[PDB]
Design a protein around this ligand. Sequence first.
Ligand SMILES: Nc1ncnc2c1ncn2[C@@H]1O[C@H](COP(=O)(O)OP(=O)(O)OC[C@H]2O[C@H](O)[C@H](O)[C@@H]2O)[C@@H](O)[C@H]1O
Ligand SMILES: Cc1cc(NS(=O)(=O)c2ccc(N)cc2)no1
Ligand SMILES: [Zn+2]
Length: 282
Amino acid sequence: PFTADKGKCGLPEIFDPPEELERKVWELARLVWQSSSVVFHTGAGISTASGIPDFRGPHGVWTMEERGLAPKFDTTFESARPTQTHMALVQLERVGLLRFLVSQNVDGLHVRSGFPRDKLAELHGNMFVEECAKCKTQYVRDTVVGTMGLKATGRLCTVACRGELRDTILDWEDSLPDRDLALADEASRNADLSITLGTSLQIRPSGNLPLATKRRGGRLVIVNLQPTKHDRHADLRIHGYVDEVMTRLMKHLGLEIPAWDGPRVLERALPPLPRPPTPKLE
Ligand SMILES: Nc1ncnc2c1ncn2[C@@H]1O[C@H](COP(=O)(O)OP(=O)(O)OC[C@H]2O[C@H](O)[C@H](O)[C@@H]2O)[C@@H](O)[C@H]1O
Ligand SMILES: Cc1cc(NS(=O)(=O)c2ccc(N)cc2)no1
Ligand SMILES: [Zn+2]
């Protein structure tokens, strides 16, 4: 569309020099250890290393539109592999170090990674997911649902209903799913650490959720190559490729980044796996 305000697009990148980057990721390690309720907020920057372009990066969808150019994909959504970051986030949840994951991404890669759906809010919906209008039954498909903008996909419900099935991809005018937003909001207020990963935090209300962690005295970490609307309210900013940051973080936490078996859907989180004992901080 046209009227849509697509915010600030194509701002310059920041590269924390190595000595400062290594120090900041150690400090992120310290905050993850110090924290009871860590919530992670992701955006399109965590899939760029999977061949999926972002929106407002140098070569983002909107940025290239603004220069009469096209975003470029190095994969299909179907052939896209979850990143090192995606798989870090799976392990951090499995070992009880991640309370909730709030994502703006429609790329479907959280779900395909094996990340438990009952700890994920997909604020902008999921390209692989269609929802029964009648009974609200969601199906996670192996291919992208054909439509966007909450339209009829041309498939019908099969619950023990014949309901109209619709894509879950929000148009600009469309408001967020209340279930996902209320749990996102809840996790975000309750958190004592919110970590943002490859989002620019320019979209209301998704981009404001990390700031609710600040009220009641929670810490905010923003990891991002470009500035973000809320760089100011952050106790830590890391200008780095998010895969280098997470692989170093995981290395500091003593956690392995698990193998991706290929697309799998886990509906409900299993009870936490063992995790290494905590270092003496103070
Ligand atoms: N490898 C990387 N490492 C770290 N940061 C990265 C990397 N690659 C990109 N980035 C950063 O990642 C950031 C990506 O931010 P944006 O492109 O705004 O994506 P959103 O998820 O916030 O988009 C929100 C909604 O807006 C849309 O209209 C849709 O509705 C979206 O759902 C940039 O700052 C990059 O510098
Ligand atoms: C909004 C909007 C544009 C759009 N186009 S898209 O090509 O489906 C797309 C989806 C995710 C990413 N990261 C890049 C492009 N989908 O939603
Ligand atoms: Zn139904």
